[PDB]
């Protein structure tokens, strides 16, 4: 049904009302109290609601529009209009000139090369603010979601037919930055992201951006005083993944599982359903063999009059007795089976369901 | 002409009227050799290649994942089994998952599961071996005149070259380890790296035949299953302090040689002097080493003649062959003010 079969499952009981629990992702807690229904609390989602894209780092870029300008000695340095264009990365050098290549004078003449930079593949850096954290909790009764914010810490949700439950939950994001790649995400420190050796631009959502620190992926190397060649560093994707293997990984969506939530349940106004129902007088049919759920508890699958209480009793060689994990089992329809979770009887005995089937296990 | 506009230029002269001259050639540089009554030569190292190399390894820098396969079992039913677990194309991992009625199991417990991914490489690099015997130096010898290649192997070190109309030159070169280094070849560039350094690179590799088998695939695929991504940029970063060469054989560095000009013959010594006036066809200019180039044209129906020159000549025996075709003369002027006289007339003031 739910919360059954989960390995990291906690059973918490109301003290001699209120119930204190700790929810963690991938885990479920089953709480039980005197005269109160047994419910399953599970932390479904923990999200960052709205994030601002602060930077876009370029991990793979391309080069277009290569332009060159050379001058003879005694004519000064070369000049390109593109040196002022921020789409271009440029560098000056000096090359051997003379009569042989069109100069009246022999010497080293200035040369400038500019390449137009375009990013093909990029990653994003988003900002997380503590007030935009949104935990999602789901509450289910043994045969209703509520969202929790640091702004709205206490949540009152209504469980149909059982009353209303109260949830008082209590959970440095401004000093961390969420680094987003193709579909993954990591939580890293602000300064480290700021010092990443990759060209970046600020994601103003406007196309044809202006990239800064372009020299970190485009550099120049001049060979034997007769040319200048422009090189691209290549895809820094794997370098990023390697550098981020030790950072805290989340799932991207913006689902964080690096956070737990301690809550307090108020069952004062909780009412137990089916106290005015009659008992079922007909027979139950074993739908499945009973099995043990890793915690000693046993699951009994039965199929069925009216909405009724399910008669459940434990009798030894001679003499009956009354412990159920599923509180007040009720058959709502004859067509739909019901699963019953029980605390196993110690010592071989007769487990009677109805008024009836006999099962030992 | 040649060897003049180059900044990395060496002037070596046969000492006290000698016929042999020892020089050292390096790429991007040119050497000017001169001897008494011998033509001035320009020696240049055109190419330095490694002839035939064996690709020892192939490193995978970008790979892809295809055909993910899964096998799960309920508790008390044993381990999961996939046929690909023995198949060397696949990287696999075993784990345990919570199973029960919810996932189709009669019993509640941790059931075994195996996941396998098929590895395929998208873009690769090579690690090749260079052997000292496959080195081939290419040298080019030219006569320095205003108006011939030899190949050298550590096997055939000494070369006799023919200069047309000028005789024969002797070259005794000596190539100046490759056993402990490996050449890393990428998309079109290559670097010289130590053998152990290449061997300890954390990338999946194979020695191949296509449709290969890759080793150490866990260096790019681990366990949800993830790919580490293109390690191209990481490699380029790792080689910033390396020696960049070009691959196609492969083009790589220095060469110490000895030139024997004993049998080299100088042409045009029997011509007479020109007695008419010379006309400056181009402005005289100083080279990166103090020498000056003078482009002149002769005026007067003389014959092929010696150009009267007075102040040391870099260009040996300047000769006007026709009045219509100009001649370029290179001379080394003395440091400080001096008069360059061309003819017997043009007078030029240099500093």
């Amino acid at each position, epitope marked *: 049904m739910r919360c059954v079969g989960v390995g990291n499952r906690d059973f918490v009981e109301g003290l001699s009302t209120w119930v204190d629990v700790v929810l963690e992702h991938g885990g479920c807690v089953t709480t039980m109290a005197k005269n109160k229904p047994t419910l399953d609390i599970e932390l479904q989602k923990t999200e960052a609601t709205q994030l601002a894209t602060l930077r876009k780092l370029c991990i793979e870029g391309k080069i277009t*529009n290569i*332009t*060159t*300008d*050379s*001058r*003879c000695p005694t*004519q000064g340095e*070369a000049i390109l209009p593109e040196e002022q264009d921020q789409n271009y990365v440029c560098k000056h050098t000096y090359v051997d000139r003379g*009569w*042989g*290549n*069109g*100069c*009246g004078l022999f010497g080293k003449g200035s040369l400038v090369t500019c390449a137009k930079f375009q990013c093909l593949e990029s990653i994003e850096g988003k900002v997380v603010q503590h007030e935009n954290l949104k935990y999602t909790v789901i509450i289910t009764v043994h045969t209703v979601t509520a969202e929790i914010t640091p702004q709205a810490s206490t949540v009152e949700a209504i469980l149909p037919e059982y009353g209303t439950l109260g949830l008082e939950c209590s959970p440095d994001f401004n000093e961390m930055i969420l680094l987003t790649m193709k579909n993954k995400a990591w939580m890293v420190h602000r300064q480290w992201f700021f010092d990443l050796p990759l060209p970046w631009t600020s994601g103003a959502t406007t196309e044809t951006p202006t990239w800064n620190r372009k020299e970190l992926l485009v550099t120049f190397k001049n060979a034997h005083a*007769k*040319k200048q060649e422009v090189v691209v560093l290549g895809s820094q994707e794997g370098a990023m993944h390697t550098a981020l293997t030790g950072a805290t990984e989340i799932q991207n969506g913006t689902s964080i599982f690096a956070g737990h939530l301690k809550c307090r349940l108020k069952m004062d106004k909780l009412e137990l359903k089916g106290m005015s129902y009659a008992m079922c007088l007909n027979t139950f049919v074993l739908k499945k063999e009973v099995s043990e759920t890793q915690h000693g508890t046993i699951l009994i699958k039965v199929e069925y009059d009216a909405p009724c209480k399910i008669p459940f009793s434990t009798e030894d060689g001679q003499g009956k007795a009354h412990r159920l994990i599923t509180a007040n089992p009720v058959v709502t329809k004859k067509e739909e089976p019901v699963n019953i979770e029980a605390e196993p009887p110690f010592g071989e005995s007769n487990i009677v369901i109805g008024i009836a089937l006999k099962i030992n296990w | 002409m040649r060897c003049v506009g180059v900044g990395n230029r060496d002037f070596v002269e046969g000492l006290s009227g000698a016929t042999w001259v020892d020089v050292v050639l390096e790429h991007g540089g040119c050497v000017t050799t001169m001897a008494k009554n011998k033509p001035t030569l320009d020696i*240049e190292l*055109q*190419k330095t290649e490694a002839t035939q190399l064996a690709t020892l390894r192939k490193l995978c820098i970008e790979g892809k994942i295809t055909n993910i396969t899964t096998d799960s079992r309920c508790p008390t039913q044993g381990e999961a089994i996939l046929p690909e677990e023995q198949d060397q194309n696949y990287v696999c991992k075993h784990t345990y998952v919570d199973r029960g009625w919810g996932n189709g199991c009669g019993l509640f417990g941790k059931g075994s599961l195996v996941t396998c991914a098929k590895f395929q490489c998208l873009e690769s690099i090579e690690g090749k071996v260079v052997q000292h015997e496959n080195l081939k130096y290419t040298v*080019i010898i030219t006569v320095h005149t205003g108006d011939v290649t030899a190949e050298i192997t550590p096997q055939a070190s000494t070369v006799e070259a023919i200069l047309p109309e000028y005789g024969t030159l002797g070259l005794e070169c000596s190539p100046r380890d490759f056993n402990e280094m490996i050449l890393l070849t990428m998309k079109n560039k290559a670097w010289m790296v130590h053998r152990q350094w290449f061997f300890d690179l954390p990338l999946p590799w194979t020695s191949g035949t296509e449709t290969p088998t890759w080793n150490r695939k866990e260096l790019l695929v681990t366990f949800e299953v993830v790919v580490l991504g293109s390690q191209e940029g990481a490699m380029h970063t790792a080689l910033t302090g390396a020696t960049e060469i070009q691959n196609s054989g492969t083009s790589i560095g220095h060469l110490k040689c000895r030139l024997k000009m004993d049998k080299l013959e100088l042409k045009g010594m029997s011509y007479a002097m020109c007695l008419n006036t010379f006309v400056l*066809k*181009k402005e005289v200019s100083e080279t990166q080493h103090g020498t000056i180039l003078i482009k002149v044209e002769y005026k007067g129906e003389d014959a092929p003649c010696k150009i009267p020159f007075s102040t040391r000549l870099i260009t040996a025996n300047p000769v006007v062959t026709k009045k*219509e*075709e*100009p001649v370029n003369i290179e001379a080394e002027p003395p440091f400080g003010e001096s008069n360059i006289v061309i003819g017997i007339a043009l007078k030029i003031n240099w500093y």
Partner: antibody
Framework: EVQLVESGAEVKKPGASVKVSCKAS????????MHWVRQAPGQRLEWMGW????????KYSQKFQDRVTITRDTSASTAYMELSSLRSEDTAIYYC?????????????????????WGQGTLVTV | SQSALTQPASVSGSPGQSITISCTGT?????????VSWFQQHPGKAPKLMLY???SRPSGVSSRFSGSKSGNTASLTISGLQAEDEADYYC??????????FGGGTKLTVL
């Protein structure tokens, strides 16, 4: 003799592309860069780009850099010029012209006697 | 197709006289480098290189053709004009941007 031979006259539709060839004979094809120059009827000569036959390096005029692709076949000792997205303005005679590379096979600076031999010229009408 | 180099549209002279075709560019093409070449084109023929390196001339070219350059203007001088010299003449220059530019062309007519 040194000779440059170009392909026959081609007539194409606007928006199409044309591939004219230039086969070199009488000299080492791999030791020379091949330039392409066009001349519209009644207009001047116009430089389109060049290809380094030794290493395949090319350089195009910024007027034609998107529509022009220059290639080479070393075994055929033949240069190729492809002009795409043809317009009626592209109606012109297309020449190839040679220039030598340095001794290292590079073509960074031309010689002073560049364009010393020219092809007969191929007429392209759009 | 506006030319980057400027030539006179038409040039004429009596036979045997000397005539000059000018070619004005900028400090980045003609005023900057000695890559000044002169090509002769007869109508219907491919251009023929007449001058290169400003003053220098190919072996096949007559010595009547001479060249000069001053500032941003080069010049082709033809001495002793004959009827054989009638053709279109184009100056060209390697620029500072690794490009080539040609003059508009001059139609030389012998009166």
């Amino acid at each position: 003799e040194v000779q440059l031979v170009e392909s026959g006259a081609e007539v194409k539709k606007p928006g199409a592309s044309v591939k004219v060839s230039c086969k070199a004979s009488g000299y080492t094809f791999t030791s020379y860069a091949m330039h392409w120059v066009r001349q519209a009827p009644g207009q001047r000569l116009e430089w389109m780009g060049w290809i380094n036959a030794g290493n395949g390096n090319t350089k195009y005029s910024q007027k034609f850099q998107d529509r022009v692709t220059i290639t080479r076949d070393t075994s055929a000792s033949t240069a190729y010029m492809e002009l795409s997205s043809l317009r009626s303005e592209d109606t012109a005679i297309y020449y190839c012209a040679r220039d030598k590379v340095d001794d290292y096979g590079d073509y960074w600076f031309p010689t002073l006697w560049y364009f010393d031999y020219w092809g007969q010229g191929t007429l392209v009408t759009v | 197709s506006q030319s980057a180099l400027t030539q006179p549209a038409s040039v004429s002279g009596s036979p045997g006289q000397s005539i000059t075709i000018s070619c004005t560019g900028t400090s980045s093409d003609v005023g900057g480098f000695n890559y000044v070449s002169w090509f002769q084109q007869h109508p219907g023929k491919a251009p023929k290189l007449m001058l290169y390196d400003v003053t220098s001339r190919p072996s096949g070219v007559s010595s009547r053709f001479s060249g000069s350059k001053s500032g941003n203007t080069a010049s082709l001088t033809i001495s002793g004009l004959q009827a054989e010299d009638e053709a279109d003449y184009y100056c060209s220059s390697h620029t500072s941007r690794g490009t080539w530019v040609f003059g508009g062309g001059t139609k030389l007519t012998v009166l």
